[PDB]
Amino acid sequence: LKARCSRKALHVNFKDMGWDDWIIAPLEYEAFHCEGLCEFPLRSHLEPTNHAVIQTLMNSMDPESTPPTCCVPTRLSPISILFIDSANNVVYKQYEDMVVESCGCR
Amino acid sequence: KARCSRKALHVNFKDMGWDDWIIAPLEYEAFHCEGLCEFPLRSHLEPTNHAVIQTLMNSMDPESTPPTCCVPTRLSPISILFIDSANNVVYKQYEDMVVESCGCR
Amino acid sequence: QCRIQKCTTDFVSLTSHLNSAVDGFDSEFCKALRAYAGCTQRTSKACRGNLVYHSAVLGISDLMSQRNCSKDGP
Amino acid sequence: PSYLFCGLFGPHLRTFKDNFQTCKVEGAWPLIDNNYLSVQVTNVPVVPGSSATATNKITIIFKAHHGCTDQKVYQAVTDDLPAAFVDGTTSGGDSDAKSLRIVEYVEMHARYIGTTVFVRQVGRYLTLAIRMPEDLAMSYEESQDLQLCVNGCPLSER
Amino acid sequence: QCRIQKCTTDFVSLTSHLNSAVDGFDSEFCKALRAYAGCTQRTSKACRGNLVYHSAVLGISDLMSQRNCSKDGPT
Amino acid sequence: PCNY
Amino acid sequence: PSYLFCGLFGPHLRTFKDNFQTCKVEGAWPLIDNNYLSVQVTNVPVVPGSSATATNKITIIFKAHHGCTDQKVYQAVTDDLPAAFVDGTTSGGDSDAKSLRIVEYVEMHARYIGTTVFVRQVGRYLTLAIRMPEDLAMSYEESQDLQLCVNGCPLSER
Amino acid sequence: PCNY
Amino acid sequence: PMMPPVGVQASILSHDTIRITWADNSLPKHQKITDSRYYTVRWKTNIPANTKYKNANATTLSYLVTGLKPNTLYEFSVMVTKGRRSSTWSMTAHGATFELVPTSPPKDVTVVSKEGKPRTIIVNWQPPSEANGKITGYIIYYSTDVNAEIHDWVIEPVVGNRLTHQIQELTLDTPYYFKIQARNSKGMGPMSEAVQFRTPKALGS
Amino acid sequence: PMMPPVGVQASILSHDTIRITWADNSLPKHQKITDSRYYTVRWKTNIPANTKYKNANATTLSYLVTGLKPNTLYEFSVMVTKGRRSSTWSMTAHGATFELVPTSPPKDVTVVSKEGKPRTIIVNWQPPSEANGKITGYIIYYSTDVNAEIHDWVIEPVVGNRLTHQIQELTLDTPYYFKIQARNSKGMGPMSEAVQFRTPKALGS
Numbered sequence A: 001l002k003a004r005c006s007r008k009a010l011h012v013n014f015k016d017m018g019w020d021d022w023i024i025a026p027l028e029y030e031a032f033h034c035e036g037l038c039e040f041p042l043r044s045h046l047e048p049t050n051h052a053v054i055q056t057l058m059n060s061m062d063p064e065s066t067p068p069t070c071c072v073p074t075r076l077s078p079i080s081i082l083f084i085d086s087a088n089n090v091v092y093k094q095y096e097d098m099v100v101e102s103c104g105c106r
Numbered sequence B: 001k002a003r004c005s006r007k008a009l010h011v012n013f014k015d016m017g018w019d020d021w022i023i024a025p026l027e028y029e030a031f032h033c034e035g036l037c038e039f040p041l042r043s044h045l046e047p048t049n050h051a052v053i054q055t056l057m058n059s060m061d062p063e064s065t066p067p068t069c070c071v072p073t074r075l076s077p078i079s080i081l082f083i084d085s086a087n088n089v090v091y092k093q094y095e096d097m098v099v100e101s102c103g104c105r
Numbered sequence C: 001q002c003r004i005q006k007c008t009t010d011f012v013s014l015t016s017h018l019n020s021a022v023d024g025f026d027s028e029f030c031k032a033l034r035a036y037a038g039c040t041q042r043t044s045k046a047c048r049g050n051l052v053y054h055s056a057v058l059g060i061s062d063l064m065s066q067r068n069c070s071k072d073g074p
Numbered sequence D, G: 001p002s003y004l005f006c007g008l009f010g011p012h013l014r015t016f017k018d019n020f021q022t023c024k025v026e027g028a029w030p031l032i033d034n035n036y037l038s039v040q041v042t043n044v045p046v047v048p049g050s051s052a053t054a055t056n057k058i059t060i061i062f063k064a065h066h067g068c069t070d071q072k073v074y075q076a077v078t079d080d081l082p083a084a085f086v087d088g089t090t091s092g093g094d095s096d097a098k099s100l101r102i103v104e105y106v107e108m109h110a111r112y113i114g115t116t117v118f119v120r121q122v123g124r125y126l127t128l129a130i131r132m133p134e135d136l137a138m139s140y141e142e143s144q145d146l147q148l149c150v151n152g153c154p155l156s157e158r
Numbered sequence E: 001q002c003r004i005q006k007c008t009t010d011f012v013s014l015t016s017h018l019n020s021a022v023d024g025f026d027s028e029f030c031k032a033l034r035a036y037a038g039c040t041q042r043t044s045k046a047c048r049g050n051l052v053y054h055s056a057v058l059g060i061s062d063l064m065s066q067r068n069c070s071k072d073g074p075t
Numbered sequence F, H: 001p002c003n004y
Numbered sequence I, J: 001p002m003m004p005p006v007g008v009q010a011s012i013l014s015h016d017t018i019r020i021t022w023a024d025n026s027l028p029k030h031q032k033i034t035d036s037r038y039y040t041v042r043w044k045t046n047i048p049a050n051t052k053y054k055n056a057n058a059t060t061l062s063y064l065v066t067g068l069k070p071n072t073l074y075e076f077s078v079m080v081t082k083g084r085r086s087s088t089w090s091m092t093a094h095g096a097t098f099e100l101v102p103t104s105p106p107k108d109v110t111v112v113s114k115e116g117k118p119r120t121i122i123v124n125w126q127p128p129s130e131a132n133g134k135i136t137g138y139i140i141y142y143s144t145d146v147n148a149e150i151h152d153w154v155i156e157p158v159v160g161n162r163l164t165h166q167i168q169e170l171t172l173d174t175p176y177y178f179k180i181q182a183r184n185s186k187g188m189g190p191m192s193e194a195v196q197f198r199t200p201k202a203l204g205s
């Protein structure tokens, strides 16, 4: 079935990726992902740009003139990563835009 | 099977009947984004860290997550001259009306 | 004030359960669209110049034409 | 091609450079004075001695453009907004020539210079909206330095 | 500094036209992949902690497994 | 032809 | 369940509340002192008279958790990072009990309290990373008010 | 069972 | 009903006169009227806004229209009546009157000091309301002497498609008087009544 | 090659002694050695890091391992040799030694003034390196008199799973001396050498 634009689970396991040779912690985190239909009308929480408002309108009126807008992360949050840096030192650093906080149509 | 690109999208306010309140412009080029976001994402698609990881995971196992999506990453305004509620002629920048760049998010 | 988002929320709430593959999609949709049209008309003056409003009005009108939803109706 | 917009209303001015200004500019003043078009307005104090002024006359000169239009002059005043040029014509040049036309806001479509001019009367005064291509809007000679749409008003008028 | 973007640009430039409907898709792709793997390997230290780099390394290794590209071979 |  | 993280490295402290601090904290100091765990460190001035200090000893007490683990003590010092508790064991309780284990960074997995402790030697000193569930990290008695991971360092130590 |  | 008149033609005679002629198909050859029928000619232009049609009855198949505006496009249509019988209005014919010398002066003469250049003035104006043809130029006359005879005033000729002009090298803290006249292919229009402008002085810092 | 020994068993005798016994399947009934074969016993624990195996040759099917650490888990395996023939190491058996009274004092005794409470001190320490069993408590002794006999020092008993303690109601601008001892199921360990801490005074505002 074709769900509407929603935030869905996405588990990232750095150990499974072999990245524990440089990442110390965390070795896994919840990243989420966005997925689903962007249909007219965009609900307010999909927080469209003016462009997405117009494109969604045009795709509704003529799906051949433009494709629909796309369900993508509209707010993301960082996670703090403890890792071994290029100088072989322990570094704690915020990696921005790692966790989807909200999805929307763009 | 085209890769993420900025494509033409012409908006005609007169065709939409908005020329009863919009004075100018009555048309403009909005563009749109469309196309595959495939591993590896070229630098100009400007992925977030999240998009980098998602594209990687979808490359390794398309069942684990869908690909990232081609969407506007930079937009620009257009100035619209129109009449507002109080019959005032207003000239206003409408933000985020024109796709300047597309990328994978 | 422009209250288009109230109209949209109502329309989305009312149609959120609709699945195009289920047997009564168009009849519930049209009733919903008609209410959405009425709601948007009641905030029209306050919303002039608001792209979300103008897009809603046109999108609704187009859908009601596409789906052959009568102008008046339940 | 990209478009520049100019506006005058109740006076208040919105320049091609998107600077919004409140100008007194009493009497006759050029909004546009370039190679293709002349836009001239008359502003009157709303009450005597007031610094707040409003538009009672709009003159537009569509300069002769060989093969497209002969020179046409449009003029609107308070309580007189015709749908024709001063010579009673509604189009430039021949009967077949539609590069310049007027339609009833009254609107002037100067397709030949990608220019639109909208004129209306709001209460006792006139409003104006101009859409012009950037290269044409900025195409003027050194001496044409007084153009409210390009440079806004003199500091002393604000 | 970290120069993974050059590696990626080269790989994308070299493979963008490739279409599986033509004969030598997989060989040309594997050649480009090996070159991409080599380019990324040579900037490993400078790129430590750059998710673009680490994702490239893993995605390359995974693609080479998926497309059955020998780790050693022509580029 | 006259068109900008 | 949500996780809180604590770190100590070359000293520099990152608290469960994400405040980053540079503390002298010379001698033995509690990082964690709660109902489930004791984390104790020894810090030494890098050179005599220096306010810059670094870690030469890490003691971890995994308190007895009935049915999961007997009390286990881990201790690492500069040039001695074992992969076992002080009693030579690598797991808590019985042979079948794997709720508490050590793996060679040397890591301690206290699954029973959703807690991970990573210990490594960077040069002449020791670093520490702790991942603990928020409700367990904040579960301590009134008298347990000195905990560098919870409240950071005393103002006089910064 | 011991697991948090 | 009755067949409307045909072949409506506008013959331009001057700046205010146009002769209208038409044919009646219901009529025998040479347009001989042998009954009590009469024609009605109607005309208007689009200047000023909302004008109404002017009408005139004609005993024969021609009518001379007088008192028209110069250089103006008019529309003309004809209808026939015979007691009870009346036709519809014919197909419209157009006719533009000839030019006349302008009969009114330039308007709204405004004089300002150029910003940062107080020895320069900007003269701004509006066209004559009775231009009576394409304005081919304007003449600006200026003087420091309000009582000087017209031939003693400084002359500043200007293009007809512009409504702003700059005059340099003037004396500061001095009254100046300005008059403007329009010109077309037929000649000079009247002069506007003199406008006074005193140039600014210096504000010592 | 040669069959490795079987049924390796660790019999705990004390805090430092474990008897190892094993069977040889290659041997005849009653495990009587009737040839020039000899056994090798190997043992180690995981404390401290990177220890190597200790080895010992045995003429018969038993070996007494001495000088072990108290309350420590050891691994033991056996192999057989006969001139040229040598077997592999048997399956490993484990054995944990008994507890002993702690034999070393608590370490890194640190005394600090509590923030905002200068009449309160915080005592922080590290366990004895020779705990020799599960620490069931500590005893903190303190005095204002450095020469007072041990029985005249204030006693502050404390839990064994904590390494920080707070002492309230002390006198300001006063030298205090602190000693700590660990305890386990076997008894009291030695006391740490006295540490001096002078309490702060007031900074009048």
Ligand SMILES: *[C@@H]1O[C@H](CO)[C@@H](O)[C@H](O)[C@H]1NC(C)=O
Pocket: E026, E066, E067, E068
């Ligand atoms: C790689 O090998 C596997 C196993 O034979 C096969 O299923 C797959 O189709 C091959 N893919 C390519 C690109 O050669």
Ligand SMILES: *[C@@H]1O[C@H](CO)[C@@H](O)[C@H](O)[C@H]1NC(C)=O
Pocket: I040, I055, I056, I057
């Ligand atoms: C034309 O004749 C009719 C009938 O006599 C009359 O009613 C009408 O007023 C006349 N028109 C003019 C312009 O005098």
Ligand SMILES: *[C@@H]1O[C@H](CO)[C@@H](O)[C@H](O)[C@H]1NC(C)=O
Pocket: J040, J055, J056, J057
């Ligand atoms: C055991 O015997 C062998 C052979 O004589 C000898 O090489 C080895 O060093 C002995 N091991 C010990 C622990 O003495």
